[PDB]
Amino acid sequence: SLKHSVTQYLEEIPQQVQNRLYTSPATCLAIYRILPPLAKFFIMAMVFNENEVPLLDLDKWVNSNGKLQFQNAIKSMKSLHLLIPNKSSGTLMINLNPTFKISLRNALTGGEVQNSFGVVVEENVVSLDLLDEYSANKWETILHFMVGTPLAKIPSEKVLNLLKHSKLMEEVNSTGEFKITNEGFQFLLQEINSQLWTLLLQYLKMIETMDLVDVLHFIFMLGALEVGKAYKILSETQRIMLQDMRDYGLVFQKHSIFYPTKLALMLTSDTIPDGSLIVETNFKIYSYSNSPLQIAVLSLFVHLKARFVNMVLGQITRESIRRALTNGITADQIIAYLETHAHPQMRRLAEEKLEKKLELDPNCKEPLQVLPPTVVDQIRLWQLELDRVITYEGSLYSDFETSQEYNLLSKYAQDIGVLLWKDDKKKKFFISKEGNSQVLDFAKR
Amino acid sequence: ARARKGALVQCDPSIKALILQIDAKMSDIVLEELDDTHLLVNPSKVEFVKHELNRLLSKNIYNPM
Amino acid sequence: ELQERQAEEKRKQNAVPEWHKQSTIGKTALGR
Amino acid sequence: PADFVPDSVSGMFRSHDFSYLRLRPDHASRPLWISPSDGRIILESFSPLAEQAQDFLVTIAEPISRPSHIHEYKITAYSLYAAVSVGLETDDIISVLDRLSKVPVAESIINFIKGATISYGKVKLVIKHNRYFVETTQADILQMLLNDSVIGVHSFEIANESVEVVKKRCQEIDYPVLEEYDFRNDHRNPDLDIDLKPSTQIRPYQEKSLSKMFGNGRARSGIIVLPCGAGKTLVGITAACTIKKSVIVLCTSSVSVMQWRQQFLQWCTLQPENCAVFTSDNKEMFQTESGLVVSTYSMVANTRNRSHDSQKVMDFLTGREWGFIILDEVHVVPAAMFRRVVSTIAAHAKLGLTATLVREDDKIGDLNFLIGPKLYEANWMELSQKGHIANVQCAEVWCPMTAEFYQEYLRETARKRMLLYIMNPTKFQACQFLIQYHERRGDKIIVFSDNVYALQEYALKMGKPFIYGSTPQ
Numbered sequence A: 001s002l003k004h005s006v007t008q009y010l011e012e013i014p015q016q017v018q019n020r021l022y023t024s025p026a027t028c029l030a031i032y033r034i035l036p037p038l039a040k041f042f043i044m045a046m047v048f049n050e051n052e053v054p055l056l057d058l059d060k061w062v063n064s065n066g067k068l069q070f071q072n073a074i075k076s077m078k079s080l081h082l083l084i085p086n087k088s089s090g091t092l093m094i095n096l097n098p099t100f101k102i103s104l105r106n107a108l109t110g111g112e113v114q115n116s117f118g119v120v121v122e123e124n125v126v127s128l129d130l131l132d133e134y135s136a137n138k139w140e141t142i143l144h145f146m147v148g149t150p151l152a153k154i155p156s157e158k159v160l161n162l163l164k165h166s167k168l169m170e171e172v173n174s175t176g177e178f179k180i181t182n183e184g185f186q187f188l189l190q191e192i193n194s195q196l197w198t199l200l201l202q203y204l205k206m207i208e209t210m211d212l213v214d215v216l217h218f219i220f221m222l223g224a225l226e227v228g229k230a231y232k233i234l235s236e237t238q239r240i241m242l243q244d245m246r247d248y249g250l251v252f253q254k255h256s257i258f259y260p261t262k263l264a265l266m267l268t269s270d271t272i273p274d275g276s277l278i279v280e281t282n283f284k285i286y287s288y289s290n291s292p293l294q295i296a297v298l299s300l301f302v303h304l305k306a307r308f309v310n311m312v313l314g315q316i317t318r319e320s321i322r323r324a325l326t327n328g329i330t331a332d333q334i335i336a337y338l339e340t341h342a343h344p345q346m347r348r349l350a351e352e353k354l355e356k357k358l359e360l361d362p363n364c365k366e367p368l369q370v371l372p373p374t375v376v377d378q379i380r381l382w383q384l385e386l387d388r389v390i391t392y393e394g395s396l397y398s399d400f401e402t403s404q405e406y407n408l409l410s411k412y413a414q415d416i417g418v419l420l421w422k423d424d425k426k427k428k429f430f431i432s433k434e435g436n437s438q439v440l441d442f443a444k445r
Numbered sequence B: 001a002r003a004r005k006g007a008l009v010q011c012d013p014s015i016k017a018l019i020l021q022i023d024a025k026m027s028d029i030v031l032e033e034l035d036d037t038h039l040l041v042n043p044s045k046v047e048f049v050k051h052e053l054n055r056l057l058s059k060n061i062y063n064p065m
Numbered sequence C: 001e002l003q004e005r006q007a008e009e010k011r012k013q014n015a016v017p018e019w020h021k022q023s024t025i026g027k028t029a030l031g032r
Numbered sequence D: 001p002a003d004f005v006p007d008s009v010s011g012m013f014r015s016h017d018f019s020y021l022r023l024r025p026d027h028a029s030r031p032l033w034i035s036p037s038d039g040r041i042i043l044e045s046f047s048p049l050a051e052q053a054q055d056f057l058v059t060i061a062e063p064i065s066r067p068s069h070i071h072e073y074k075i076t077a078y079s080l081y082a083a084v085s086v087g088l089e090t091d092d093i094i095s096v097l098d099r100l101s102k103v104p105v106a107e108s109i110i111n112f113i114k115g116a117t118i119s120y121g122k123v124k125l126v127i128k129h130n131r132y133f134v135e136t137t138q139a140d141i142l143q144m145l146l147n148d149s150v151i152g153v154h155s156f157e158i159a160n161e162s163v164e165v166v167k168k169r170c171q172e173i174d175y176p177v178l179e180e181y182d183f184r185n186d187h188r189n190p191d192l193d194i195d196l197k198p199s200t201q202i203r204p205y206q207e208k209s210l211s212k213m214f215g216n217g218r219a220r221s222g223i224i225v226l227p228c229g230a231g232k233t234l235v236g237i238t239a240a241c242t243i244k245k246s247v248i249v250l251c252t253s254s255v256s257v258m259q260w261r262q263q264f265l266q267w268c269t270l271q272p273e274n275c276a277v278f279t280s281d282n283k284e285m286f287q288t289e290s291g292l293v294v295s296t297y298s299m300v301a302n303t304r305n306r307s308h309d310s311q312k313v314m315d316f317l318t319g320r321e322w323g324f325i326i327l328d329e330v331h332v333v334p335a336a337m338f339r340r341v342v343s344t345i346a347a348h349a350k351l352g353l354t355a356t357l358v359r360e361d362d363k364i365g366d367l368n369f370l371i372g373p374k375l376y377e378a379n380w381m382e383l384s385q386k387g388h389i390a391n392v393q394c395a396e397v398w399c400p401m402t403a404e405f406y407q408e409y410l411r412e413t414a415r416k417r418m419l420l421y422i423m424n425p426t427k428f429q430a431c432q433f434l435i436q437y438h439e440r441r442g443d444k445i446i447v448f449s450d451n452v453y454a455l456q457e458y459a460l461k462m463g464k465p466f467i468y469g470s471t472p473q
């Protein structure tokens, strides 16, 4: 949902503001890449020709097989307002946005760009030693704070304010601590690309009054910049944002020239294993990983017991699982992490198990379960234990003069979906606290 | 026409009996019996029964050391 | 055909029950 | 652990982080990880040298868990005491351990192996004409054994009953005793000419167990553990056939004793004339020079009330000097009174057979000085995948308690509570459905129930036979 999340945000932008967003070719080049392959084909056709083409001509290009894709492509292209539908002379003519059309032409033809891509000072620096370590550590520092593991340096208030204000990393002053949420665990599960977009996407929504267009001109322009290069100094709002981006480990500053980082290019497109582990029937964990990230995430729902240089060994316990569940982590997410981070040895034996299962009876195709079924059931069973006691808040209605009134009030609650329990024999029912006021008002009327 | 604020508890016979035993020891726990799968409980005691009941159930489950 | 039928019966005699095929947790609990 | 910076996540491991040590360049080949603190051993079963260590580890380290991929062993004093017995010195253990370990062996581990792998093989207990002599191969031991507060080429007598005391005492002192029998040069005891018939087919694991016992050439006293139904009975037959001397067998049941004789007869070439069964039914003993008596612990461990018919047999057993004793289900010998038999009866070698070597109390460890160390153990899954034993679809059915009964469960006491939730109606329904469903599948079902009252109620309700203590043979 990488492009979908970014595309969804662009749709809510007003058309008047969308036009301003297309002025800079740098943004246009990225917005052109995010569209589906078929959509990109048509855009490249219309950009260089100064004419209007009927939609029927576009349909002729697509084969009958790809008709469904032509509907998603046109719908997505029309949603962004990049494709302007003009109807005249009884024909629904189709044209591209002039600003987007002009912006794309300038970049591709090498025309004036208004420094959308920046400038070069030729003061290259070493990236692996400093840039990789700095951003990796800076991106790791926020993760250690997110995971809750102790670490001396804490992230700046700018990002910290964003985290609390965002659904990520729910906090309470009375508790005085920060804990991960259901979406927080999902955030940790997402790849680095999406893991960076989520925080940025939250940042886009957090910012208020720094112009909305200026923020996009900077973030998209950041991907265009190439790591290990210098760029002179930029908008006034971008200056404070540039410092703000420095807190996210995206841009490195020596203290006139700013240097992008590996994460900057990773934002545009994508790009034994570390983190792979073995799960036994004894609820033991043996991770063939040497990295704080894999160790830190495993400790969320695993009671670590010992570690080696190359691997880390631990044992799953009810207490550790209960601690993880208390934080809002669903068992489905836990198994997904284990399944998607399974050791090749488990996969090979699991494939053999599927082959053996199909070899004996090839009629049925049982699911490929890497880890023994008992672990999944017990983990799910532990989840059921937490959900054993179910309690609601509300009011109980009784002492009804007539059955008709009891049925009327009870039926009304059911219609509005606030009824939790009823009994015709006792003429009593219970409604949620949320619907209490609505039921009372109906009772009076 | 009469409303009574409270907490509606939905559970199984086994949990229902455990709540009754806690209600027997502490009268205020259960306010009224609704059905074999629903009980009315005092809101204040919810935060205490939930943690204490788990300790009672811990006897039925063997945790090795 | 009889031997094939006998083989089919032999395979059936060795097939595991249905509840072993799928994890029956979501389904209603066993009882009367 | 010198000049090793702790990691930010090192606090999660409480004095258990083992990242301070370095990994050898040949880690990709070496399959072993060694815990420098607890002695835990993690084994790679999908890497080279896995099979070469799967047997060595079992000798020096007891198996904690051995799942499909990664096996878990552990080195302990008892485990080392078992390996040192079968011609193994500290150098051999260290050399193989280092050659297979990805990480270097810590000094603490080396110290542990050295201490316990040097004790075996300096004091011998011998028996002659029903008289127990603690014979030693050097004269220096006299200043130790004769001067011990408990005890009392040089040989001195010792009380037969006090064997259980000195043997435990020998554990505390540096030198433990080893029971080795040179049956080849023992001509005083009448020999028995028996051998395994050609129809026998010794399974590979059976041969491995025998090799670990007869590797040096002298029979060693100890315990052999094999999976239930693996053929522990046949193990005793093979030992009797190779020793070729008078042997006595103790088995913990009346039916099982009847099983042993039939198995003896079928598997070996023991003539019926030389075989005698000492059970409650018949009490006639063999009169041949060498023979076999198969009895039970209750017939050898009982001390107060023995029958007149059973009193002569007990004297018959005690009078003669047996050459070999086979203790089937050796998990019952360390009991309060069964231990008395090992000190009373005379035997130059002792063997223990049991599928399970665990029990609720801590007396299991006492087996080391009672019968000897554990020689060999066999995996369960390994035999399952090789067709030696069947695969099992183990299941656990959760039957919710009915509302009516559960109400009494709260008020009722612990002793009566058991019967309350064991006879809930839901269990009756499930059992009937399962029995009918599995019966049509052509499967022979076994229903276990420790409660006799429930057994009769279930049996009479379903009209099926039931068996318990009162039923006649």
Ligand SMILES: Nc1ncnc2c1ncn2[C@@H]1O[C@H](COP(=O)(O)OP(=O)(O)O)[C@@H](O)[C@H]1O
Pocket (backbone or CB within 6 Å): D201, D202, D203, D226, D227, D228, D229, D230, D231, D232, D233, D234, D355
């Ligand atoms: N080598 C073998 N060949 C044939 N059957 C064997 C062999 N070893 C064991 N068995 C069979 O295994 C079964 C169980 O033997 P038993 O000695 O009672 O096992 P345990 O005492 O270990 O429970 C018997 O049916 C026996 O005949």
Ligand code: BEF
Pocket (backbone or CB within 6 Å): D227, D228, D229, D232, D354, D355
């Ligand atoms: F059933 Be056996 F004697 F383990």
